[PDB]
RNA sequence: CGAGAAUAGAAACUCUUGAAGAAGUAAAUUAUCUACCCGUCUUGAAACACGGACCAAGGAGUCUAACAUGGAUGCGAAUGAGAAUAGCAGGAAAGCUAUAACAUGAAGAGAAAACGAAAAACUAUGAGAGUGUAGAAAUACAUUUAGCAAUAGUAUCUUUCAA
RNA sequence: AUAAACAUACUUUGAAUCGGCCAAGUCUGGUAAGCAGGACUGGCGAUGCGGGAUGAACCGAACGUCGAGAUAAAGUGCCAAA
RNA sequence: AAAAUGAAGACAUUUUAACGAGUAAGGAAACGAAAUGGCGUAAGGACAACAAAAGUAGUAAAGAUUUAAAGUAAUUUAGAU
């Protein structure tokens, strides 16, 4: 009972029925695995800016 | 006044509801069918529009 | 309601919505969780990836009453006595009578520190306390009591 | 024939009050009339949110209303959902319009000096919406959303419906 | 007045093979066979009920006399259509006795309503 | 309703006990009513029927009056010498009659019907004095609450309350929106039919006055 | 969810149904009343 | 909450009492027909008795299939010989004198659970509909002549009713006898196999007499009247106030039962006393009316004018049509 | 000669057939065109593939239990407590009532010991509300304001060898 | 440049299915096969209608019920409309 | 699909526009502008002459045979025996 091994027939027609799902913009903006020193500078500034912004909030 | 849908007719002494008037006050109206006007008669000299 | 089932809508259809090529046969791969490692391994890997194996040490007879410890955060402490009492003792300080919150009497043994307490002195009585729970109660001007 | 990309199928938007609630049916009747005549996007928004399913109309507690109304003192918060009570935190004075108020939430809002309105009164008072703040509750806080997906996934695993010998 | 009632198909949609076998009745059943000559819509045998056969919405369910049927069981049930005698026609039910039929037939003459069973259960 | 849990309200069990009842319970079932002349003399409503009694058929084709010649309890029927039918070849056969279609007009009282009739008479009197004691007790309570009225008002005509005080309730606007389509359509049709009946009545009254 | 259902034995002979429950109340109540009538400080 | 007044009538003399009673707050609860349907669909099943076929019905044979090679089907066959039964069909569901499809078991689910607060919601909604004359009559009651649709009778007149002649007299005084005679005149017999099981007569529904704790001796008089059902004020349910899932039952309240309503159900602002944990709900609409909003919006000059759709002209051929 | 515009003008008809049966519809027959045996497995059956002589009645996704999603319902940091069980009227397998053990949830991580959550948050885009102008019918721009849901990314905090 | 608001992005739950077959300005093994196996596309399966006399795939063209016209593949001595 | 109207009419509203082939398979009920529309079998609770005798029935029920009518269809309705 030998059977047909494999065929790519109708495969492309299936893939385009619901087309190639592009990724969202949030995928292109991930930061895991970036430069170690670059992330340290960014964290330092974001911590500095948040503390200053919070200080004004407590002041007013 | 009578409703537009109420055309009272005489009852041969048969049972009638309370609201149905007694035939002594019911006057029949002759059934009317024709509603269109016949063709008007014009001058013997003038011709019809449908010429 | 058997008149809302799908069997009443599939009367007249030969296969009753189960397919002509692949019939509705007795089994579909075994009874129960059969083939957990052989042909339904892709199912267990996908949806229960730690089903097979061992982890942790056995407790031959577990005393489940020894782990019973209901917890309440600090922000939820005043709800045990209600808002009417909370506003009534709102302007108290050291020296005069202050309401006591009996956490144990309400079924709560441990008091945790989460959220913010209202700025009123209060005496909290419970069996266990957290480090931040006592800090928040004391920073507001209150006290902590032990029990049992 | 004609080469259409896809055939005509029902648009998956609800346009009436789901269920047989006589009062919710009248509210949709009132705001479908208001949005059609006044042509105000506020009545269009309220009408659309009145026709969502119960799961898609999440609750908003009094703590969330208090925080969102902090810099809106003389305003009427408008949330098309049930307003529950957050017993952890106090309730300030504010006016809320909502479909239904919890027994404790209504007392807390009233006892603080605020007001609890219905949607019929809001349309009578502010039909197009002038001193109102539109608020909706959080949808992702449902526990059902934790188990959606593949628990073997490397990035965002699911949460493994508990069952036989779950460790 | 009476509109022209137009029927798109005056025949009957008979069941498939109902003419050949007496166990297969004439009530219509859509053939669900995989090789059925009719459901495949062959030439000759391609007659199936479809929504396109429906008659005009204006004249649907209208009797040839031009009025809509209305079943009545007693003289009181006639009073529900006495305002619409130009639209509805009475219809004495098949189980109404001959005595109650005379009252219905007489009363409808008083109220000027057309009865379609005026010649039913008449005595010898 | 029946409140005795021993007795059964099952029709099938009732018929079975009728078919399988013994002769003792069959005699007490085939009872007939006494006539006015006999009722006044004995103060007894009905007694079980007996042979040689004289009865009068009141229901059936022939309302003859004869004598009881056979009390057949297996068939639950009786026979009269006057009701017979000729059996083709010439001999006559009696016609069975149910005992509930006749009334007794002349007793056959030897010695124990006399004792039964006395017992049946005293039972009627004893119950009557008991009902009288209850009715007086019921009436004594009515005059304690309404001292100005007497108990005969319940047997005479009743005058309804004609006052029509209405009530304002903030749901009557919603009434039409709280019915389903089948009961809303019927309700609206009843309103339309009622209005048209009033229209015909109004038109008739105008003609009658004029 | 992995199912853990112990219906592989003859549960049909293990089924206990509570059709006698509305009559346990009448039994126990009546006996409870009978005790009070007999000697009241025993049902005490 | 002005809560308009309600008059109390004397059953014997027909005289209204001099002291009106405020309408209980339970008559303003939202009338939710969907909530009642949920409760009534469940509660109507709670009276069913267990039934089931014999466990060994149709399985009392030692039959085995004959197999193939005998020109007969493979359904099992009765063993032995000498009778017509042997060699016939066997246990199979389609065979004659065999077991049916999945046999009905006596441990089926007969009674249905329902939350208490949903059951109390339905009774309050059913009580409210009993005070709407449109809903009461549309259900099939003759209430054209009654003075007040929340019909109340004096507690003094109720205390004197000991016989069915008095109860009938009272029902005539308050013009409630139209419904009783509708039931009497329309009594008939059931259509179908229900007569074999004992259910022969099929009567209609009439007034419901709701009484308090002080009217326990007047119940005996009303019970024999055809089409008159009595209930205590506390024991109300959807099975009484909405028979057949048609809300709006005609109810004859008594003075003792009418006054206890406020304690049993509470108000829309006070928690109930008789039914602990339950409070009357607030409808989704404060005033279930839309006219007052439209006119106010019209007065503020906000609504546009009503639009009649223009008649779209039919297509023409400009090359062939000069006009 | 002539568009726009201003000013005045004009359309209501004939014949035939029909309760001696019109128009339509139905049944039978005839005539032209048209029509392979249904159900099923199969790439493919009208198949020289199998079941089917005919008719009537019976005949096959049901019930119990655990979980999940989903649409309608009640209540909502609680919900359920028709858990057993205990009372009420009525006589009741129905109905009503019981400040209540517990179930699920409000707190999560760790094998376990031991623990147990705020910087009263930040950023981005986003729902809604006004004023003015104009087209001019609806509508289209300018500008002030709020920034919920959702998504993504940040600080901060509990637990873990490890988030 | 062109198209796109009954556009777009989806989320959840689930059915059936993974025996395939044909064509070819295609390929591999084979002398070859209505043989065996592949790349791309279109079809048959799941599909009737007009033409090729007849045909699962060829050519035209895909179907709610009808009337009137202009057509497509292809045809005009008769069967058979021209 | 979009506009208009909307407590009750009615034919499940009015107008305009686009569309309608199909095996396996899906579209549970309810949801006034209705998140597909309906026919039939049997049983249970209601409703059925609104003015105090309230659906039909010995002046002929159910059933059976046929003749016609309504519906695209499932089927329903009526006459005669």
From TrEMBL, chain E:
The keyword Ribosomal protein is annotated on this UniProt entry: yes
Protein name as it appears in the record: 60S ribosomal protein L32, putative
Keyword line: Ribonucleoprotein, Ribosomal protein
Signal peptide: none
Family: Belongs to the eukaryotic ribosomal protein eL32 family.
GO CC terms: cytosolic large ribosomal subunit
One BP term from GO: translation
Any one GO molecular-function label of the UniProt entry: structural constituent of ribosome
InterPro entries: Ribosomal_eL32, Ribosomal_eL32_sf
Domain of life: Eukaryota
Pfam assignment, any one: Ribosomal_L32e
Lineage: Eukaryota, Amoebozoa, Evosea, Archamoebae, Mastigamoebida
Record carries keyword Oxidoreductase: no
Taxonomic source organism: Entamoeba histolytica (strain ATCC 30459 / HM-1:IMSS / ABRM)
SUPFAM superfamilies: Ribosomal protein L32e
Automatic annotation (TrEMBL), chain F:
Keywords: Ribonucleoprotein, Ribosomal protein
Cellular-component GO terms for this entry: cytosolic large ribosomal subunit
Keyword Ribosomal protein: yes
Highest taxon, organism lineage: Eukaryota
Pfam families: Ribosomal_L26 (PF16906)
GO biological process per UniProt: cytoplasmic translation; ribosomal large subunit biogenesis
PANTHER family: 60S RIBOSOMAL PROTEIN L26 FAMILY MEMBER
Protein name, UniProt field: 60S ribosomal protein L26, putative
Originating organism: Entamoeba histolytica (strain ATCC 30459 / HM-1:IMSS / ABRM)
TrEMBL record, chain G:
Annotated family: Belongs to the eukaryotic ribosomal protein eL13 family.
Protein name, per record: 60S ribosomal protein L13, putative
Protein source organism: Entamoeba histolytica (strain ATCC 30459 / HM-1:IMSS / ABRM)
UniProtKB/TrEMBL annotation, chain H:
Biased composition (Gly residues): 81-90
Alphabetized GO MF terms: RNA binding; structural constituent of ribosome
Residue segments, region Disordered: 76-95
The entry's keywords: Ribonucleoprotein, Ribosomal protein
Any Gene Ontology CC annotation: cytosolic large ribosomal subunit
Protein name: Large ribosomal subunit protein uL4
Lineage: Eukaryota, Amoebozoa, Evosea, Archamoebae, Mastigamoebida
Family membership: Belongs to the universal ribosomal protein uL4 family.
Domain Large ribosomal subunit protein uL4 C-terminal: 276-323
GO biological process: translation
Keyword Ribonucleoprotein set for record: yes
Residues in coiled coil: none
């Amino acid at each position: 009972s030998k059977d047909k091994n494999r065929s790519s027939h109708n495969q492309s027609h299936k893939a385009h029925r619901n087309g190639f799902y592009k990724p969202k913009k949030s995928a292109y903006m991930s930061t895991k695995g970036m430069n170690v020193q670059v992330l340290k500078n960014t964290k330092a500034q974001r911590k500095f800016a948040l503390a200053k912004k919070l200080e004004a909030k407590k002041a007013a | 006044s009578a409703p537009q849908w109420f055309v009272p007719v005489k009852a041969g002494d048969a049972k009638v509801p309370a609201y149905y008037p007694t035939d002594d006050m019911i006057q029949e109206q002759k059934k009317k069918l024709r509603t269109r006007k016949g063709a008007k008669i014009t001058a013997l000299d003038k011709p019809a529009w449908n010429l | 309601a058997t008149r809302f089932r799908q069997t009443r809508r599939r009367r007249g259809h030969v296969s009753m919505g189960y397919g002509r090529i692949g019939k509705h046969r007795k089994q579909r791969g075994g009874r129960g969780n059969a083939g957990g490692q052989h042909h339904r391994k892709t199912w267990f890997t996908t949806f229960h990836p730690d089903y097979f194996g061992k982890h942790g040490m056995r407790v031959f007879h577990l005393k489940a009453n020894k782990y019973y410890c209901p917890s309440i955060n600090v922000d939820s402490l005043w709800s045990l006595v209600g808002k009417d009492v909370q506003a009534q003792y709102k302007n108290a300080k050291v020296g005069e009578e202050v309401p006591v919150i009996d956490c144990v009497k309400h079924g709560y043994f441990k008091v945790l520190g989460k959220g913010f307490l209202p700025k009123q002195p209060v005496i909290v009585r419970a069996r266990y306390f957290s480090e931040k729970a006592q800090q928040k109660i004391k920073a507001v001007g209150g006290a902590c009591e032990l029990t049992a | 024939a004609i080469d259409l990309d896809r055939h005509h199928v029902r648009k998956h938007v609800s346009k009436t009050a789901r269920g047989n609630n006589a009062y919710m049916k009248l509210l949709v009747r009132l705001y479908g009339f208001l949005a059609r005549r006044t042509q105000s996007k506020f009545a269009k928004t309220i009408l659309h949110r009145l026709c969502l399913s119960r799961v898609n109309r999440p609750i908003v507690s009094t703590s969330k209303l208090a925080c969102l109304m902090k810099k809106h003192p003389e305003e009427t918060a408008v949330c098309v959902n049930t307003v529950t009570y957050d017993s952890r935190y106090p309730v300030p004075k504010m006016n809320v319009c909502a479909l239904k108020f919890t027994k404790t939430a209504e007392a807390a809002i009233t006892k603080a000096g605020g007001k609890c309105l219905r949607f019929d009164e809001l349309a009578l008072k502010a039909p197009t919406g002038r001193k109102t703040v539109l608020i909706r509750g959080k949808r992702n806080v449902r526990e059902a959303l934790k188990h959606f997906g593949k628990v073997c996934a490397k990035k965002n695993p699911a949460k493994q419906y508990k069952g036989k010998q779950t460790k | 007045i009476k509109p022209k009632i137009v029927k798109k198909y005056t025949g009957h949609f008979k069941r498939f093979d109902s003419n050949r076998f007496l166990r297969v009745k004439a009530s219509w059943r859509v053939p669900r066979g995989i090789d059925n000559r009719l459901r495949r819509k062959f030439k000759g045998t391609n007659l199936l009920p479809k929504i396109g056969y429906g008659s005009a919405k204006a004249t649907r369910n209208m009797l040839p006399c031009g009025l809509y049927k209305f079943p009545v069981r007693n003289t009181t049930d006639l009073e529900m259509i006495m305002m619409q005698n130009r639209k509805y026609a009475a219809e004495i039910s098949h189980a109404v006795s001959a005595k109650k039929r005379q009252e219905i037939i007489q009363r409808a003459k008083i109220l000027n309503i057309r009865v379609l069973n005026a010649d039913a259960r008449i005595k010898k | 309703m029946k409140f005795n849990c021993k007795v059964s309200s099952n029709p099938s069990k009732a018929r079975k006990a009728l078919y399988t009842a013994n002769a003792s319970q069959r005699a007490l079932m085939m009872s007939a009513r006494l006539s006015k002349e006999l009722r006044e003399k004995y103060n007894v409503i009905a007694i079980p029927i007996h042979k040689d009694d004289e009865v009068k058929i009141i229901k059936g084709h022939q309302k003859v009056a004869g004598k009881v010649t056979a009390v057949r309890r297996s068939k639950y029927v009786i026979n009269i010498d006057k009701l017979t039918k000729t059996k083709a070849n010439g001999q006559t056969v009696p016609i069975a009659i149910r005992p509930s279609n006749v009334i007794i007009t002349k007793l056959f009282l030897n010695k124990d019907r006399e004792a039964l009739l006395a017992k049946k008479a005293e039972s009627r009197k004893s119950y009557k004095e008991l009902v009288a004691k209850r009715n007086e007790e019921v009436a004594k309570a009515f005059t304690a609450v309404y001292p100005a009225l007497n108990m005969d008002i319940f047997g005479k005509k009743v005058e309804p309350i004609t006052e029509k005080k209405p009530i304002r309730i903030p749901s009557k606007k919603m009434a039409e929106k709280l019915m389903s389509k089948p009961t809303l359509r019927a309700y609206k049709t009843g309103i339309k039919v009622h209005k048209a009946k009033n229209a015909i009545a109004a038109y008739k009254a105008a003609l009658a006055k004029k | 969810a992995v199912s853990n259902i112990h219906f592989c034995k003859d549960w049909r002979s293990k089924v206990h149904t509570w059709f006698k429950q509305p009559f346990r109340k009448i039994r126990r109540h009546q006996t409870r009343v009978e005790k009070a009538k007999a000697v009241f400080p025993a049902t005490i | 909450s002005l809560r308009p007044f309600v008059t109390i009538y004397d059953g014997i003399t027909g005289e209204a009492e001099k002291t009106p009673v405020r309408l209980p707050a339970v008559f303003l609860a939202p009338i939710r027909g969907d909530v009642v349907h949920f409760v009534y669909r469940n509660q109507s099943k709670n009276t069913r008795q267990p039934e089931g076929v014999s466990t060994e019905a149709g399985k009392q044979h030692s039959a085995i299939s004959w197999g193939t090679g005998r020109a007969v089907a493979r359904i099992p066959r009765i063993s032995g010989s000498g009778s017509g039964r042997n060699g016939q069909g066997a246990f199979g569901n389609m065979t004659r004198k065999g077991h049916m499809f999945s046999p009905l078991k006596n441990f089926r689910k007969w009674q249905r659970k329902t939350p208490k607060q949903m059951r109390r919601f339905a009774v309050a909604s059913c009580i409210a509909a009993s005070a709407v004359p449109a809903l009461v009559s549309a259900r099939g009651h003759h209430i054209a002549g009654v003075p007040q649709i929340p019909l109340v009778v004096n507690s003094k007149s109720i205390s004197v009713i000991k016989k069915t002649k008095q109860a009938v007299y009272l029902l005539k005084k308050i013009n409630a006898y139209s419904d009783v005679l509708k039931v009497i005149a329309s009594k008939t017999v059931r259509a179908g196999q229900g007569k074999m099981r004992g259910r022969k007569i099929k009567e209609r529904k009439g007034p419901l007499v709701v009484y308090g704790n002080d009217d326990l001796q007047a119940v005996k008089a009303f019970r024999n009247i055809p089409g008159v059902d009595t209930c205590r004020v506390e024991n109300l349910s959807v099975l009484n106030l909405a028979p057949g899932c048609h809300m709006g039952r005609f109810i004859i309240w008594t003075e003792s039962a009418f006054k206890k309503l406020n304690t049993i159900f509470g108000t829309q602002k006070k928690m109930a006393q008789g039914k602990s944990g339950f409070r009357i709900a607030h409808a989704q609409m404060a005033v279930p009316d839309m006219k007052r909003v439209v006119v106010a919006a019209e007065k503020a000059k906000l609504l546009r004018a009503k639009i009649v759709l223009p008649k779209v002209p039919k297509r023409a051929n400009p090359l062939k049509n000069w006009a």
